[PDB]
Write a protein that binds this ligand. Sequence first.
Ligand code: FMN
Length: 108
Amino acid sequence: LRHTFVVADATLPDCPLVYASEGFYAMTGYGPDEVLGHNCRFLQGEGTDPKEVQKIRDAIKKGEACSVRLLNYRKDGTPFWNLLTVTPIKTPDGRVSKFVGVQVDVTS
Ligand SMILES: *[C@@]12=NC3=[C]C([C])=C([C])[C]=C3N([C][C]([O])[C]([O])[C]([O])[C]OP([O])([O])=O)C1=NC(=O)[N]C2=O
């Protein structure tokens, strides 16, 4: 299954991306210069379901894992459907350190 993988830093208050796989750049059209240090929400646009966005926002705050279907947009403006699964990574003290995401393009 063709998938992409990113890492967000949860020690910073707005979860900026700190590592992205070669496919994530190829799929979205953005280079690392425009991805690292930013929140993943730049991928969103008009037809992105705000209720679906809210489930990811809630789970991050509550430190749970979450799986949603989102409409995303490449850098060239064209849309694609992104099955996104975010997973919390905890330190031994139960605190969340990083969030990890698997993104699958499900436009079939
Ligand atoms: C994005 N992938 C992605 C990967 C990780 C590890 C995390 C933590 C989040 C994402 N997002 C969501 C984005 O960062 C943000 O959490 C949401 O927009 C909801 O929060 P807000 O405050 O903005 O409502 C991903 N979002 C995407 O659209 N595409 C992904 O690949």
